[PDB]
Design a protein around this ligand. Sequence first.
Ligand SMILES: O=C1C(c2ccc(O)cc2)=C(Br)c2ccc(O)cc21
Ligand SMILES: O=C1C(c2ccc(O)cc2)=C(Br)c2ccc(O)cc21
Lengths: 228, 228, 13, 13
Amino acid sequence: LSPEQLVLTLLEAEPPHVLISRPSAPFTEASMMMSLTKLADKELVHMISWAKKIPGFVELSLFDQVRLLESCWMEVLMMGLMWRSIDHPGKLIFAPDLVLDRDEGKCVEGILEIFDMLLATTSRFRELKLQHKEYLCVKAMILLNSAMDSSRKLAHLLNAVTDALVWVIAKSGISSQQQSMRLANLLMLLSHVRHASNKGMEHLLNMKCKNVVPVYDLLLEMLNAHVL
Amino acid sequence: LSPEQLVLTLLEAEPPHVLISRPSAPFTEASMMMSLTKLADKELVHMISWAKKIPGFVELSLFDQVRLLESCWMEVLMMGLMWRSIDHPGKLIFAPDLVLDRDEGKCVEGILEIFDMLLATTSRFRELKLQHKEYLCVKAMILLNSAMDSSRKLAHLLNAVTDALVWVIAKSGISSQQQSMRLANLLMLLSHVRHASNKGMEHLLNMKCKNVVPVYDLLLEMLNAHVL
Amino acid sequence: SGSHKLVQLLTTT
Amino acid sequence: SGSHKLVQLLTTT
Ligand SMILES: O=C1C(c2ccc(O)cc2)=C(Br)c2ccc(O)cc21
Ligand SMILES: O=C1C(c2ccc(O)cc2)=C(Br)c2ccc(O)cc21
């Protein structure tokens, strides 16, 4: 499976956007969390289907598939959020009809911090002019790199996606040194995504304990991350 | 300054080897943690000197120097732990007189999770055969990329360390495709360091609150500031 | 708990 | 976040 075919396969596997609408009135702490969690819940279902379309993912052991998904889900959700927001500075496009202003992050205690590192990272991806194909590779890499016989099969799958990303950057036409530098600049941002995910999951868990918003079923299983 | 001499300046910034004076008392729960925090504290002092020895770091605003070190210190400490443990499979070489077994991490609740994370990432760098000069650039990059007149100075320096790592990989003489692959593999591990670091901080904070480990002035400060 | 909904979506759908 | 330990080490040799 050549790099182009892998990239092409990821492009097709892109899940359609989940449509959710902003509540009628100005957000309240409860209505914002209900919105964010309802969207996350529905996107998680599609994320599972997306993952199965990633070459070799279904060939890993069920337990590994689970561990990988329990470990990266929020990062994947956020990587998708930043991409949708790439062409809208100061804005977070959670959904077509759910465009949040940084200032709206004031109604939920502690989420404003989250919105900021997301906006900051987005600005960075904007600075670098992240491309669609690049984005596809990176999101897949996040899933396969969340390693937080298949283990060997996993490494091979990550190198396949890495090769694809390398291939995409090469097609841009920049010098060989600049390709290396771009590959580096793009990947140095994964640490930021991982950190944002951590704050996000700590935050959501807190909102749940606070009874600020209900969290149950699939969203919950992912949150607890212990179905195994 | 050529990539080569920038790397030489990093080698020159390396902190001295630190010992904890006799790991006496088979390791129990209290003595283990007191040993780990005692060492962290000594290392933090050396870490400050190290940061200042990196060309351009002291040129950053005082506000930036502080925020960069406050966010990356645990990651840097762990990156150092891994480089020292790279040639000792199954062991974490915190110091010559502080060598810990996964079984010994069973003593403290929540530590086995951290140790396994660390051992696995160390095992990964070992597979990749991480070189001493790569370690130097990576550690430096951790400090400069922990950013969740002066802003432009940072990006400049971060670009310089990145250019140095690309250079180091080029001297290995391997294939161009393999150089890109190696670069991506090394960088993707920063996610794992950031992750284990977030877990160590959380465990350490809990320990502070219970007053289970002696009060360490510098370490206490680095810990408190980070969360807030 | 440990088999149901993540696991269901992964192997059932 | 200052106060002084980290800061004094950053401004002395
Ligand atoms: O669920 C949450 C999301 C989210 C939702 C959909 C999406 O596509 C990306 C991220 C964020 Br931000 C967030 C921040 C704090 C929380 O307690 C829960 C969430
Ligand atoms: O201080 C701690 C370290 C450490 C110390 C020195 C070093 O070079 C690297 C890591 C770890 Br692991 C750790 C885990 C849980 C804690 O509550 C405190 C620490």
